[PDB]
Symmetry: D2
Subunit: 252 residues, 4 copies
């Protein structure tokens, strides 16, 4: 397995960036997974944005805290290769994991949500322990959608030797810390966002600026402009993690 | 000028990293600044921590949230080139800024602390406005000690054209987004930590994992092991920001 | 001067409860102040809800975090006896305080917002310092809209001997701790909510239950039912705070 | 059955109030339960603290967030009738429930901890469902130690008709809202704390005021002075919750 992991797809520039560049590189990977938490004009996922991702070559789409902004998501969750955080409570729509099959090899993908500085949910560590006991595969990729670097690092060491790779998202800025932990698991704190960086985490500068300055609510406004494609490549060969490499593409 | 900014010096490994390597590249810079908020066994700063950094070639040390862990910091704040967050309220020991002087040129260094997911402090945006209104220099470097990426980015844009460069700390992971904002101000979300990465943000893996698994307090133990020196180089010339470059060195 | 303070007016039952009962006891007071943060269907204040409050016999209306929920508030803020939290940043619409005149005697009303478990606003302690320094009156009433009971008690003690009384809001639950501080200042942790208690914090029980059980988004729905009028009577005389008495009236 | 539930015993004063008064009214109740997470100098519980509580007439002691401040607590958790929140992770020391018995009738007492504005723990709602299936008793008393009133109420309604009574703690201020829910379950937002009220939630006024003004750490210090004994009387007859009444005692 040759896997491409694509950093948070941010609003219209992000979706455009994927649609435009993925086709030119899809051939380089066996499987492509992407976080599409903000794919629907910045907030969530809808049928349209899902389609453009799939049509661009994405095989599986993960969500996050915004996983419920749009109704259409519930249809995507029951019949499409779309997953939400594993560690929502029982009775939650959709699945918290997915099994990808390619070339006779299997890859178990799992997204989990951190709890520090975020909403209360089930314990990510033990939810992972249980899952990994019931679902076996050639490779296991765990995406940790969290705010705290310590929580992301805690989960990764905890997963060392069990997961083939642990990639973080949510923070929107790509980190220069791609490495392999003592027991072999690959790791990166944040993949980064795929969208226009001529903004503040996807939103229009002055909008966010107005929030910090006035202390008064300011409706989200997706920024528009040239985008950056952010992703991380994972090389899984012979049931063992081989290499991890961040990837960047600047839209012309 | 040519300035080197060194990412949070974390406990004994971080201190060794600076003492062992800084001497070797010291002559390539006019000014060397370092965040020493975790220099003392991972918590705050004390006289020994301070002397070591100085002996290595550090010209100025900044703090943050752990600034008040050791009473020895007061003497330091009182008569040494050590600074604390500008945006503490009136009646706070020490200074929140420092105007360095070298070969006839001046560099105003200021550290502000974010408020999102952190303690309630004064408005850093307007705190900076008041300072920059009365304090002038050839160049200005602002360190933003904050948790949220949106807050660091908001502060950078808000200072764009006024500050020569804006660097983020507190996260402990180097980000790959060193760039030049519209009005010329250089920026990087997080310089990264200086210390052993065989840990959880400098803390012993076993210790942090226990906190996360049990939800019960666990006294902080500083991880020990090979270190990584993390810094960011800045080039200011002709009264303008020329370049910004993430720097790394692995301890043999 | 005999003052009535009315606990958070919650959505339609709250507006009703006041419109019904206040006219029957208005005689008993010289001045009446109300928190209308949740007046307009539980979220904010607008022309209609405001008008209903004045007609019921309210002389001044205060808000809080939900102040900006309806843009109709702005007009109200610049021409009507409506005040928002004092500690918002410079340039914030509306006044942070208001002077009430009743038979020669003057009453300075001030609303302050806590920062613990809330948003990063200006320092409320020093904010009051600057105000009470440049604004005098026979009596001073400070409302503390905050979440943490420690912050309310600290603000109260800090104002002891300065404010005639300090009353807390935001909790939506009446507290039984009305008393006199060491230096005379009257105090109660939370006045209580004015609206239907057949709900959770004024919202439908089911909606809120769904939020805690699913961890997923649930739009706010104002509960309906018998209202329970909550307020606190303040007796200031001879320039000195004499009494404080919580008041309750259940809708028949 | 007549049960007396004492509010959080705060340090020396609180501990004194219980020892002096409880022996006087002890005969007026069948079971006496007390929150003692602040009994030992305002920081957790210990042998001395526990002995004094038992010798005072307390049959069971509950804990909370500070349950782990003292090493001696673990031994108490193993043999003595002391409980910590049920909603900690599996493998946690001690129990989160306790079966009391008095002449034929049985009482299941449970303590859960809220999560809003607090630490990440297991889902208290579903934790209660599971416990209530395996543990049955004539009456059930659930203590909700939390910050958010909305969470305490949501839990109360979730237990309505299932729990005999639901009492909240952690806020340190008695609420005037004791009542009966639609399905008979008795409820009160906060029993209030037992200790000297001439302080900010049990702590020295000056100390807490210093924290709020400086924004710098100040070691906790328990206030000393005349105490207020806060509790709530519960009456369970014919297999249903009959009466709930707040209870106060000013120290001579
Ligand atoms: Co490991
Ligand atoms: Co997110
Ligand atoms: Co991201
Ligand atoms: Co290429
Ligand atoms: Co070199
Ligand atoms: Co700009
Ligand atoms: Co820090
Ligand atoms: Co009447
Ligand atoms: Co005082
Ligand atoms: Co409010
Ligand atoms: Co019910
Ligand atoms: Co507590
Ligand atoms: Co309490």
């Amino acid at each position: 397995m040759r896997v491409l992991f694509i950093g948070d797809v941010m609003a219209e520039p992000g979706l455009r960036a994927v649609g435009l560049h993925l086709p030119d590189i899809r051939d380089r990977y066996d499987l492509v997974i992407a976080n599409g938490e903000n794919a629907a004009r910045g907030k969530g996922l809808d049928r349209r944005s899902y389609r453009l991702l799939r049509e661009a070559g994405v095989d599986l789409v993960s969500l996050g805290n915004h996983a419920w902004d749009h109704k259409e998501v519930y249809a995507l969750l029951e019949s499409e290769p779309v997953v939400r955080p594993l560690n929502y409570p029982p009775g939650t729509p959709g699945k918290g994991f997915w099994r990808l099959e390619v070339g006779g090899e299997s890859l178990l993908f799992v997204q989990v949500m951190g709890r520090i500085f975020m909403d209360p949910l089930d314990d990510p560590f033990r939810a992972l322990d249980r899952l990994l006991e019931e679902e076996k595969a050639d490779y296991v990729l765990v995406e940790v959608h969290a705010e705290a670097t310590s929580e992301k690092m805690a989960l990764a060491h905890y997963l060392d030797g069990r997961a083939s790779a642990v990639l973080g998202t949510h923070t929107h800025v790509p980190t220069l810390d791609a490495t392999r932990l003592p027991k072999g698991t690959l790791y990166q704190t944040d993949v980064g966002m795929t969208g226009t960086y001529h903004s503040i985490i996807g939103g229009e500068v002055e909008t966010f600026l107005a929030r910090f300055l006035t202390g008064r609510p300011q409706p989200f406004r997706a920024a528009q402009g040239k985008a950056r494609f952010h992703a991380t490549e994972l090389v899984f060969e012979g049931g063992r993690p081989v290499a991890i490499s961040p990837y960047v593409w600047e839209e012309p």
